[PDB]
Every structure is written in C-alpha cells, then in structure tokens.
Write a protein that binds this ligand. Structure first.
Ligand SMILES: NC(=O)C1=CN([C@@H]2O[C@H](COP(=O)(O)OP(=O)(O)OC[C@H]3O[C@@H](n4cnc5c(N)ncnc54)[C@H](OP(=O)(O)O)[C@@H]3O)[C@@H](O)[C@H]2O)C=CC1
Lengths: 499, 499, 499, 499
C-alpha cells in the first residue's frame, strides 16, 4: 500500500461503507436536483440568475481564502496532551502544573518563517513551535521557536527584519542585499545567524528539533513570590538535520515533507513527544547577570541555570480538517493564566500587542470563538458583546456593564499580577550596543566542533556571496569581531565565490 | 410594577437568585484580578502594554459594530412556529405543508425601510415582515412586507428608489425633491404610494398589520404540475393604525414603540398569530390575466382568485440576545425548498441575487453558520469549504470535489426544479408603460371610503408641499391620470400650503 | 425660496446648466445602453446573469454600508482653518503655533454620544467636537467634547459606561436601570452627570457650545522645557441651549436639526468661529494641585490657571459628499506633532490605543489613505507597506527595511519625546475614591444659580424616576454626599413621581 | 555585474544621489525621533501604550496580507500598450479597434493555477495570461490562459475541479487520487489534459507562450450586425518550453524564474510582444459547426476559421511596487466595451459573475478605485455611492437616483447589447456526453509527432502511477477512447512503474 496520508480518501470511504451517502444541499440546506448542469435557456442558451445552486456554491468558492499569517505562513499541526511529571509549584501556582499526572489538552503548529503558503518545508529558516494549552484558567499560548534566541532585541526592528527576509517590494524576489544589509547593520543578529547557518538550520521534519519559549518569563507561586524562567522542550525523538543537498532535493520532490512526516508518524501510532524543562533565575541573580537577562539575543548558561524537568508534550491526534483546525489556529503570547507573567523583554512586550492584533485582522474580531481557539476548559464570562460572526449566545441577556447590582460576573483578586518596582524616564533607551559577540564566540569555539565550524562558514558564504561587496565587507567585519578565524574563513570562501 | 421589558435585568437576577456571580475572564478564559483599574507604573504613571486585560476588552469594544442592513435597518424579532391547518398538497409537495398539524420552527423580523438603526418605529414607511421556516428540506425565507405590492417593477430601479428615500448625498438630510422627483418620473409607483399615504402607512406596532409575499411565486406538486401563487398572512389581532398625531408623539416619546410592544405581548403570554393563505393562478389563467401577473405593482383581485387557508404563524418566544438572534438574522428569498420556486417577476429575480450578496458583506462569507441562520433541521452536506470564521468541523475529511468515487454527498433528482418554456428575444423589454393607473383607481374609489380619501390627500400634500413647484405639478398630473378628483384634491391642498 | 440645504440639487443642476450630462457607465467605465430595464428571456421571462449592468450596480448597492462609530455615530462635519492670534512659542514648539497669522486647514465633526446613525440631534447627551489640524508635522487630532470633564477616570470602565448608556442586550431598549445602576455604583460620575443634566445638556445646534480637550496634555518648547496644559475653544456665537420641551419637539420635527443649522450657517456665509485658549500648569504646580491634575473628573479653576489666548477656529466650507468627507473622518488622539504630547491621564492613555484600533476595523487597515484622513500637508515616508485597498504608489520601489545603506527615510532626533520621570510598582492603583464631590459641590453652589439648581434636579428626577427604588436610593445618597439639599431636592421630586 | 532585478535597490539609491533622505514619519505624518528603540520606563522597564510610533508601525505590519487569489495565486505583471495593426471595423465597433496605429495602455498578469503565493514558477500547470485594456469606453479585461481550451464545459464543476487540483482537506497534501478521480470521471477533460502533459505544459517563462481568450465571444459592428469570435495572442518571441528535468532544477534553484525573466527582459529593453488575431464564425456557421461552438473543450480548426490579425501587445514597463500594481490587479471578463459581448459558453457565463464577486471579497467593495484597476481613460459616472475605503470624491453632490430632473448622468442608447433569439425549455441540459475524444485524437495523431507522443505518455504515467489501481484503470480507458495506442502506451508505462 501507500503511506496513510496518501490513503486519506480511501480510509474515509472505508469508515463509511455501512452508510448511505448524504443528500447534497445548498448552504441553506435545500436538496440539489443536479449540481453538474447549469440552468440555461435551451442547451446553447445563456445562464439564468434563478440558478441559485450555481450562485450559492460559486460565491462560497470565491470567498474560500483568508490572509495567510504575515510570518510563519507555511505550517503543520497536531493535537495531544501535556502531562505534569515533576512538581514546580514552589515557582508557579499555574493550574496547568498543579499535580503530577495532571493532563491538559494541547494544540501545536510547526512552521517556517519567511516562505508563503506555497513554499517548501525543507529550507534554511527558524521553525515555529507554538503550543496552546487548554487550561481551566483559560488558554496558555507558549509561542516558541526551534531556537532559544532571536536576531534582534527590540520589537521596533521586527517589521524591518521580516521585510529584509521576504521579497523585494519592486521585483517580488528574495534579495540577498536586503538580507545582509540588515544583518550587517544590526550585529545583535550574529548569535541567531550563527545558529541558523549551523546544521540545525534545516531540521529533518518537526519531530527532530527542540522547542523554546526563547523569552525570559516570570513565574509566581501561591505566596506571591516571583522568579524569572525560560521554557525548554527537548525532542524525545533526538536532534536530526537534513544536509543542504537532501533539503534542496526534498524542496522540489516533496515541498510538504514536514506535513507528510508528522501526519504519517501520528497515523501509524509513532507519537512524537518532547520533555518540558524550565531554567529559574532569582530577582537577585537578574541584577548581577553579566548581560541583560531580558535580552532575546542571550541564553542562560546551563552551568549556572540547570534545566528542571516539568512534564511531557505528546502529539497523538491529526487534524480532521486542516483549514478549520490548523490554518485558523491563533496563538497569543498574552494568553497567560495566573502563575505565568511576562518579563520586561522588549521583544516579548511587543508580542503581547501584535498577535491578538493580527488575529483580529487575519481571522476576525471573534476569532476566539473559532473552536480550536476557544478556551473550552474554562467558562468565558465578561462584559464583551457583539462583533461580526458572533456565535454561541453572545452571553444571552446577562447585564453587559461592570460594576452592576444584578449578579453578573465579578473579578477575582487572587488573579492579580505580581508587583515589581520601576524608576526611570519615559525614553527610547538604546540596546544596539548590548554585547553582540561574547555568547557567539562560545557557540563558535566550544559548542561547535571543527567539521560544523567549516559547514557554518560554507553555508554563510554560499548565501552572502550574492550581496554587494560593501555588504560582504561589513558582514565579514562583524564575524571577525566574534572571532578572527570566523571572519577569515568566510572571507576565504567569498574570495573563491567572487572568482 | 413596570412592563416586562423594563424588568429584563430584574428578572435575569431573580432567575439566578440562588447562584453566586461567575468569574470575570478575558476572551482567552484567563481570570482577571481587577477589571476596574488599569496597570500603570505608580499611581500617576503611564499605561503599560502588558495590561492585556485592558487591550483584550477595549479591542473587542472597538469591533462591536457591523454594517446595518442597507434597507430595513430598524427592526424587531421574535420566534415561534408555523402549523399547517389545511391540505394544499395538490398545489405544493413542500415538506413544510406535508400534513395538517405539522409544526415548523420560525424566526420573524419586522422593520421600517428608510430609517437607520437609531430612527423611530412609528413613521410613515412600508414594514418588513420576514419569516424564516426551518424545514427538513432546509430554510424557506418568505421575505414579506405589510403590502401586497411595491413602488417599482424592475430591480434596476431599486437602488435609485432607495437613494431617493434616503439622505441627500451632500447635506445628509431627507430630501422631498429626491422623493417626489423619482415618484413623479416613475408613475408605476402610484399604487404603492397610494397605499403608503393611506391609514395603513403607520400600523400600531407589528402585531396589527398583514404580511404578504407580494411577488407571484410558483408551487409544484408530487406529479410535477405547477401553479402560480401569492402568500397572504393576515393578522389574527386585527388591522390597527396610528394617527399622524399619535405617530409623531411616539416618534420622540418611544422611538422603539414596536420593539417594546412585541416583547411585552410575548412576555405576558399574549402571543400574536397570523393566518397564512395562498391565491392560486393556473399557467392558463396567467396567459389571459388582464395585466402582467408577475408585475409587482399589481394585485390578484380576490373575486377572481379567492384566498385558500394553509396554516397559522405564532410568535411565542422573545430573543435572549438581540444582536446574536435579530441583528444577525439573514433572510434570502433564494432559500426555497422543493415544492416552492420563483416566478419571472423581474423584481423577485433581482432579489434572488441581492440578499445572499449583501449578507456575505454585512455578516461575512460564512453567515449561514451563525446559529439563527443555520438550517438546523436539515443536514448541510456539500462541496463548499473554508472562508473566514469557519465554525463546525468544515465537513471534516469528506472528499471535497464532485463527482467522486468515495461516497461523498450525491444530488437527489426529485429536487430538480419544475421546467418551464419561455420564447422571445433576449432583450431589455420596457415595462415603464404597463398600466400605472387602473388598479390605483380601484384602490382610490372602492378600497378607500370618503374619510380615507381625504386623509390620503392631506398626507400626500403635507409631504409633497416641500418639493419644487415643477415636481408638485408633475406629481399632481400622475394623480389626475388615476382620477381627476385624486389630483384636484391634492392640488387644492398644495395651493393652501404654498400660501 | 427654501433654505440652501433644501436647494442642494437645484444649485447642483444650475451650476452645470452650461454642460451636457455625463454618459452613465458601469464601475468599469463601460457605457450603459438602458439602466431602467433588466435583460430577460421575453417580456415575462427570467433574468440573465449576462446582465452585468444589473449585477455591477446591485453588488455596489449591497455594500454601501460600513459599521457606524461604536460611539458618536450621529454627527455633522465642516472644514475651515485655524489662525494663530497670540505667541505661545514659550510653551510649545509645534509648527501649527509657529507665528501670529499662521493658518492651518482643519476638519471638524460634531456628534452626540449614545444614539445610532438614525437618532435625533436635539437629545440630552455630551457632544463630540473633534478638530483635525493638517500641519506640516502631520495631523494633530484634538478629539474634544462640549465638556471639560468626563464620567469616569480609568479607560477600563469606558466599555461598561457606554454599554450602560446604549440598549439592553435582550430588549434593545434604552434602560434607566442600566444608566443609574452604573452611575450610582460609580460616584466619580457625579461631576459630569451634574453638567449633563444642567441647561448645557442640550445645546442649540453645534455653533452655540464650547469645545474642550478635557484631558491634561503636555506642551514642549524649543529648549526641551515642558508644561501641562488644557485646551479650551469657546464659541464666538455665545452659549445657547434648547429647553427640554423645544428639544423633544425638534427630535420628531427635525431629527437632523444640527446638520441643517451648520450647513445653512456656512452656505449663507455666517461662518461659526471659536477662540482657542490654553491653561498652563508647571510640573511644580502639578505636585501641589489639591487633586490628581490628570483626573478627567476634575477642572483646573480659572482663578489659579487663567485662560491664555492662542488663535481662532473658523468653519467656512461644507462637505461636498457627506459619506466620503464626514462618515469616513477618523480622529486619533495619538496624532500629535512635536511640541504636543500626552499626560499620564489614564483615560487619555487608553484613547491613544482605542481610536486607530477602531479605525482599522470601521474603515480599514489603510484608513489614513482616505483623502480627508490623509496628512496632505506632510510627506508620509516610512517602512510601512501593503494592506487592503492600498492607494497611491505604496512608496514605490523604496527600500522597505530600517536601517538600510540605500538612502531611504531617516528618523529626526529633534522629534524625540520630552523626558518625564516616573517611579513606582507596576500595579492596578485604585482611583475610585479620588474625591468624587468637592468640585461637584462648587458646581452646584457657585456655578449654577437657584433657577438652574431647580431645573438640574427636575431633569435628573425625570429620568431617574424610571429606575428601581434601590437604584433611586443609592443615586440620591451620592447626590446627598455632594450637598444635602442636592439629594433631598431630587428625593422630593422622586416621591411625587413614585406617586 | 548582476542582473537588473538584483540591482533594484542599488539603482533606486543611485537615482536619488543629490537628494537628502526623506524624514521618517508615522502614517499620520508625525516625524519620528528614533524608530529603532521602544518607549519604556527606564532601560529595562516595561513597554508603554504611549509608544504610538510602535503601535502605528506594528498594527500596519499585522495587516499587510490580503487573501491570495483563490486560483492563479502565483504571478508576475507588467505594463505597456496595445497597437491596432489591421482593420476589423466590419466585425467590431469597439473604440479600442477604431483606427490602425491606435494605441491603448494595457496591464498584464501571468500566473500558474494551483500553486499558492510561495509555490515555484516552473511546474506543470496551465498559465494565466490576463490583459486589461484601459479604453475610452472603459476597461476591457481579456482574461486568457496559455491554452485555447479548458478541462470542463460547465461552471458548476469549476470549484470541484480546483478542489481536486489543490490540497487534500485533511492532510493539506497534493493528492493524485483527487486529481485522477475527477479527470477519470469527467472525460471532457481529455483535450486540455493532453495539452497540459505535452511539452507546452511548462513554458520557458512567460515570454515564450501564447495567450488565448479560450471562450467564443461576440463582436458587434456599427450596423448592429454580430459574429462569434475567438481571440489568439501568439508570442513574437517564439514557443519555448522547459524539459521536466530543467523545470525540477529551477523549482528549487529559482522558484521565481518567471518573475525574474520578465523583469530582466523589460529592464534591458528586450520588450516581449504578442500578435493578437481573431477567428470569426457567422451565426449561420455556428448552426452547422460539427460540435457546440460554445463548448470550452473545443477549438475552431484554423483550416475552416483562419486567424485574422488585429494588433500587437507590447510590455515595456515593469511594476514599481509589486503589491500595489500586481497583487491588487483585478481582471473581470464582464468588463467589455460596446462592440464586444459574451457568447452563451456556459463557462464564460459563470465567469461574468465569479470575478467581480471574488474581487469584492479579496480586495474590497471599492476595488475598481485601486489605481491599477481604475478605468482611467473613461469618465466613471453613475448612481453608485459609498462602500468601505471610498476614495476620490464619491461623485460629490451629484444627484444619486435615476431617473432625475437635475442633469445627472444619462444612458447612451448606442451602447445597448446586441439582441439574440434563443428558444427552449429553461432546464439543466446535460453537456457531459458532448463528444470528449474527436479533437483529442487529431491533437494526438496530427498535431504531435512521435517523440512528443512518447513524452506526453511518460508525463501522464509519471503522475497517474500514484493514483489507486481502479482510478488508473478508468483513466486509461478514457485515453483508449481517444485512440487505442494512447491508452496502451500509458498502460505499458504504468505496468513498469507499478513494478
Ligand atoms: N388583493 C389583495 O391582496 C389586495 C388588494 N387591494 C386592492 O384591491 C383591488 C382588487 O380587488 P380585490 O383584491 O378583489 O379586493 P376586495 O374587493 O376583495 O377587498 C378589498 C380588500 O383590500 C384590502 N385592504 C383593505 N384596506 C386596505 C388598505 N388600507 N391598504 C391595502 N389593502 C387594503 C383588504 O384585504 P387584505 O388587507 O386582507 O388584503 C380588503 O378586504 C386592487 O385594485 C387593489 O388596489 C389592496 C390591498 C390588498
């Protein structure tokens, strides 16, 4: 036989062999006499408006598409559960962590970053690894990537960074001058550029890469004590990457390699899992951390901040309809239940605004009423009403203003955010020169071996060669500031390429 | 005590008196600690982006409004049932008429025409009387008015007519020159203008007016024989109208008089009902009818085409949430189950397009998935997929192309439309001169008495007086063509006014 | 003759008498042969889809409506200029104030608050008085009201307040229980409630009321020195109000009284004007102001903070198309040029978010490209691209990422915000008990005389009478806390009303 | 040096040398002091709502995307002119054809069919070749393909056909069972399937393929006489195709090969051109044509219906902004000036509805006001008003109802559509069995040579091999019905593949 993905229709038919086919209806539920021949005046005559079967079906077809995600457009999804394996209730009172063996349903979407909906899975790019936990205190969206860090440390640069990675506004072509002009002018990118052009730039599908929250978050316990944390979810399938050569072959041979691989793994009962850990940094430690502990271009060294196990993420269920359950999935970093809070990370702060904002546009004002986005293990009760495509009962006749004397929903003071002190001017403070090289040097020298340093420099030179010489020169200077051999290896490869 | 409408919240609280208030949440289901004070840095400090309670609630508030209906914006709704009382199965095989005693859930919306969402109920205007039948063969929308006729008999004049009835595009004021310029240039309007300015121009709320399909429709029986029909649903509460003086007082005293009256009637168990009748005209009779039987400016005389009783419409349930159940209600004349079809009425033919079209704009592509619009007593099964705000399962993994060898839904040949012959050139046939006066003379002389003729002429003159003299002159000439006394009575009143 | 508003079409025709009528076209510019008769198969046959004249026109008709404003839906607009008369360059470096005699084009929209698009102009409610200044440093939107204060002092209460003032979510009726339950539970409302139920609750059209910024704002001069300020624009036509009785008569006689009065004033050359003043409070004075100087329920007494004259607002031009130039007008309090900045006022801080947010929904992502919203006296140049209904050239082939080495637009350090210092915990500071009565007592005792105190209490009692006794009791107690006679006068009137 | 496309930013910068960079502004035109650092309280403090620079830019970024085209998503565009070279005045009075030498501006978009926005250019698929003519009689959209025929001949099958060619609704994978189940059940597809799997299935970019109107159209001359026509626009660059092997290499090496090739051709002055021809069939010839002359699965043999030259299409101008000028381009087959009309082709009749319908969704109600879509060589004048994102003046104060006595636009009777007679029952006439094989046999035996018959069958077998055996069997039977050797050659290749 073929793979289970190929046999989707075959299996759908088999599952139904015991049933008569449904009656074909209009959207309004009126049975259709003939959906293959249009209503005309004679066999060689024009089409009538009173063919409302045609108009009903064609008008829906005309409206099938919604905007793709502004980033991470190309993706795959599955469903399963999170199970607590260890007690971290001393750090977080979040209900999702409440007792060992406690299970919370999850939804997950894996993605590339720059490519549009029709692009190939097996390309050099970060990977999105977004986890929605359907908790009794509402949804917790851990909107992670397959890297602990990012290219920039201020949200104001994010639209510019994404523009530089996508298409030239005139030609609609990928543009290496855009890519390398931005990175060469913004050397904070050196850390994530080094990770991206390493072997992990192209994981072997979604099951063989790690996930990370990337940002510093804040955990609050039942006593109102707070620590800073990082989330790490390590693949139980083990790290595995595709060679540049294999990735380029799969790019045209199977552009949907990651989709197919994840579906087949789950369909054959080979359920992928990840182990969720935290690192914990005290408020005192944050004060003496040698960098900004909220800088998204920095990791917390495992030596000083060991991984503490929490639980297991398991994907054991495929989507039944990809559009309804995956394309319409919305992850909001601002969805955090009590016990989990943001840090001052300037990037995370921007994300608190951007996700719900783009969801209201891409899906619609009432996107949280789409079933996969619904906090279906919490009771939603508030003073919000109306908006387009308003489903369920819109909270019925319940008093719609707060406060009221009519016993409508009440706030719960135990859910109040933890209180941190700040002092300072309202100002745009510069983060451009917050050490761009130190952790990058340790990655290059200590984390990588000789063989992977060589590939790293070939991968960089193989892309950078197409940028103008002034951009090549400025980029090489930044790599030299990490380590003189980093820069000179790339320069040697550029000299060979520039003939 | 006050009326039941006034005691809505009082009763909501009483119905719950044994229960504590629910927990106030974000749209994401996260409990909120304090929904009355914003998150700031210090008590006189700036508002933080990390106040996602504020942004979640304010962003939904910012999105509450949808476009109002392009016409019939101001309305009231209720629900109940249709019950078959007589057997008309010899005319129509429609399952809604299948056996005496058969009950089908209905939704009804009543409305004015020209006024926007904040306008007054008790003004001179036609009234919408739209009935949605949720049948096993899907929804049947009988999109009726409180008049058997309309001002025009071609859909191409509809936008112009509504423009003329609306606001001046520069001043945003009601414009008597626009109203009377259009009516004076389009004398087919004389019949409905006569009805509009009669006593029934301002019914005493919604319970005291008749409903009509207005259009000729087609009924098809189990043998594939067809007749033409009209739908009449006469108020069991009796015709009652408001005087111009009472209407003007209620306009400012209670702009929502019709809303309040319908809600209080149902809340006190005084359920309003209507008796549904048809008139039947054979294809042969349509050939010799002395007018175009599909001309919306013409009635079928009761003498020649007697009312045949069918059943009862009863409204026994108030909306629980007006936005979700009434503002979002969508009636499509194109929603007709087998046994009911359109006639060639040029106006009805235009309506087959316009309603689903405006609904996809006003509500969204997936507006048939809004609960009140959903054909919840039929099984929707087809090859339509996706679109924004896709709810349900989007028909799961079902094969999405027709035809297919995988047992997805099949067309049902018994639902094929009745097949009519027409012969003629495809062209734009002029209908402007299809007798604009004969049935209007009968209305003026036989349907009205002396007292009603006097008020009719005072009502017309009272509005027409504000139009330019050239428009007055040519409106009066049209009334003179109906009957010399019709014109001269109006001219006498205009002379007094133009004093 | 009639008023100039009535003669809109008459004047349009006369102005063109020297010209031939334009050729009637489809939206695509195709000339139309007959736009009065639909394309059918025979004179009594069905409508063809190849009637693309019908579909083109009907589809546009079906999409005419956009969401009305969530508040201030009912309005009137006009255009003119702002002229500097006095030098305030020692307080603000804003180019709009740069030299005496300097003129800046303005757009203004006047509005009620609670009523929808079809509601009456002459009702008790605050009035919007929004001014757009098209400056060389971009648009400055001074989104003011006819009151220096508001009902609440934290934006989290705004959606609840507006809900309380609009329709019951079940009945769709105005609901005195909702209005007075909210106000009685939120006594910070006493100051603006007292103003609202005074004579100024119903101004005689838009030309006879004052405008105010309401909020404290910040002014910054060329030396980087800052002061706090209030904006006052006082009617040069003088304060004039409508009696409750006259307002109720105009409500049904001319629901568009304000629209008509403004249009006719400008059309006859009777151009209304306002004098713009500031009050100035130093950072030192802000420290010792006996209340929160950023509390929207408080005024700055004229005795301590005198009005300083700035210039004149003149409206000398009527809209030509109301939908394009008034309905689509978008005012954003966040539109402030260099020299004008927000204060920490919690209400103003919320408004910085809400207006552009609601505009992106009501109008569309590219609403700043609508001509009346366009900053047409500034050069818009940035790294923003695309979005629906993208006009002009979308900034052509300009580099779309910042920073860049390709000479695309550059930030300008002179435009950097003034540096204010804040210190404190991040928390939800309760402002509910920030003195609700002291300035209200001064209003009741000093600003009103005996005759005005009597009407005030009759106006309040006449509405509050319809609320439940427990709500009446709680509301009266709040009025008693202002002054024992305030409460007892209202209670005496309620006793008479409650029979 | 590099190709002109690579040097887009280099050239933009060079063209601006000797100008200072523009000032970076918000969308409201306010200059920005620093767009690289967010506004916080202290350097490691929280993000403020008062950072309206961040919100203005981020909210626009969040709204960049619009729905991609439901088909033909992946495309390239350019601009130029149409020049009349021959006189066809005797067939069509259309102004665009009026005089030899006469030039009309055009816009063109080339595309694949099934692939999404990020898919590869060099894949086996039909190609779109859409031409917009900006004529004095409004826009003429000739919405063609690189084939004279299509897979189906009734619009009711079009959504199903497209579904079958796109992604499995559960797995989101291309599905050979869906592709071949549809084609095997619908043998009318054989003609276009044979063309698709021939060498012309993968043209060498957009300059080396033909365009066709595909449909029969109607031409009407100044005497009101009509003929039927086909449009052919043949490449002046000559037919050139990519081998399967080269196409697969470019698919990963340059997914935007077609984009780059077109841009570089125009940028270097190598302007591509096509010769526009018509075929003419009289109404008499249409009566005796051996097939349905309106059947989209059939051609008119050149022998019986010779190509008559009309003019030249020349592309001499690249887009300056791809999103504004190409992504936003909207072609409506219903955009036809007088002298050009639809035929009764059931497929064309469907397209008259579908294009403006999907445009109102994808772009918005007022999409004809987007500059590239605007009929800028006609004066648009009608009774249409308002809608979202209304630009220009919305036709100012012009009377907005027809007819009127106020000199607003008038219909032009010379533009009336030509009147055709049709007779028959209004019914759903089955076209499924209208000869599926005869023209396919001629293509297979006479048009192709031995070498290309071999590749045709290898290309088909190479894809068909992945469908289930029952689908392979049914598809081969249809190929056998064309010609026994067609079927048996494919069967032999399937046997080798199926091992
Ligand atoms: N046939 C119809 O449905 C209607 C007919 N007409 C008039 O009747 C004439 C044809 O005679 P025919 O139909 O036999 O009528 P009939 O002579 O049989 O009876 C007259 C009927 O007109 C309706 N009517 C009463 N007052 C009004 C009013 N103010 N506005 C509108 N309708 C009213 C009533 O039926 P009811 O209201 O129950 O329909 C009434 O019984 C036409 O010229 C037409 O103007 C007018 C309205 C309805």
């Amino acid at each position: 036989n073929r793979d289970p993905a190929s046999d989707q229709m075959k299996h759908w038919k088999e599952q139904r062999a015991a049933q008569k086919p449904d009656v074909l209806t209009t959207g309004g539920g009126n049975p259709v006499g003939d959906k293959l021949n249009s209503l005309t005046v004679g066999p060689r005559g024009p089409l009538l408006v009173q063919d409302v079967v045609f108009t009903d079906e064609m008008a829906h077809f005309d409206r099938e598409r919604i905007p793709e995600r502004v980033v991470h457009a190309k993706g795959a999804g599955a469903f399963g559960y999170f199970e607590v394996t260890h007690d971290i209730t001393r750090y977080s009172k979040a209900k999702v962590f409440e007792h060992i063996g406690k299970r919370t349903p999850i939804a997950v979407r894996f993605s590339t970053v720059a490519g549009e909906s029709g692009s190939a899975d097996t390309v050099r790019d970060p990977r999105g690894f977004a986890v929605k936990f359907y908790t009794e205190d509402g949804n917790w969206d851990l909107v992670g990537n397959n890297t602990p860090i990012f290219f920039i440390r201020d949200a104001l640069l994010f639209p510019s960074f994404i523009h530089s990675q996508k298409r030239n506004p005139q030609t609609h072509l990928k543009d290496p001058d855009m890519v390398w002009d931005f990175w060469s002018l913004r050397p904070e990118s050196l850390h994530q550029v080094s990770f991206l052009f390493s072997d992990r730039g192209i994981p072997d599908g979604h099951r063989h890469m790690d996930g990370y929250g990337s940002h510093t978050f804040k955990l609050v316990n039942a006593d109102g004590e707070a620590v800073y944390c990082k989330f790490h979810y390590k693949t139980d399938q083990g790290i595995k990457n595709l060679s540049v050569e294999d990735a380029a072959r799969l790019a045209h041979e199977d552009p949907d390699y990651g989709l197919r691989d994840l579906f087949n793994a789950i369909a054959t009962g080979n359920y992928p899992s990840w182990t969720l850990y935290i690192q914990v940094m005290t408020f005192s430690e944050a004060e003496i951390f040698p960098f900004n502990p909220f800088d998204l271009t920095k990791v917390w060294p495992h030596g000083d901040y060991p991984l503490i196990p929490v639980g297991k993420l398991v994907l054991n269920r495929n989507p039944v309809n990809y559009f309804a359950e995956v394309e319409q999935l919305a992850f909001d970093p601002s969805n955090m239940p009590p016990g989990i809070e943001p840090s001052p990370d300037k990037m995370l702060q921007g994300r608190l605004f951007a996700y719900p904002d783009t969801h209201r546009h891409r899906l619609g004002p009432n996107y949280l009423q789409i079933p996969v986005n619904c906090p279906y293990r919490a009771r939603v009760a508030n003073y919000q009403r109306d908006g387009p495509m308003c489903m369920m009962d819109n909270q019925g006749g319940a008093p719609n203003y707060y406060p009221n004397s009519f016993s409508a929903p009440e706030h719960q003071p135990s859910a109040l955010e933890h209180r941190t002190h700040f002092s300072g001017d309202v100002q745009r403070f510069n983060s451009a020169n917050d050490d761009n090289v130190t952790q990058v040097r340790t990655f290059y020298l200590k984390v990588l071996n000789e063989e992977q340093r060589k590939r790293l420099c070939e991968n960089i030179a193989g892309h950078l060669k197409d940028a103008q010489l002034f951009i090549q020169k400025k980029a090489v200077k930044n790599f030299s500031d990490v380590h003189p051999e980093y820069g000179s290896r790339i320069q040697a490869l550029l000299d060979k390429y520039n003939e």
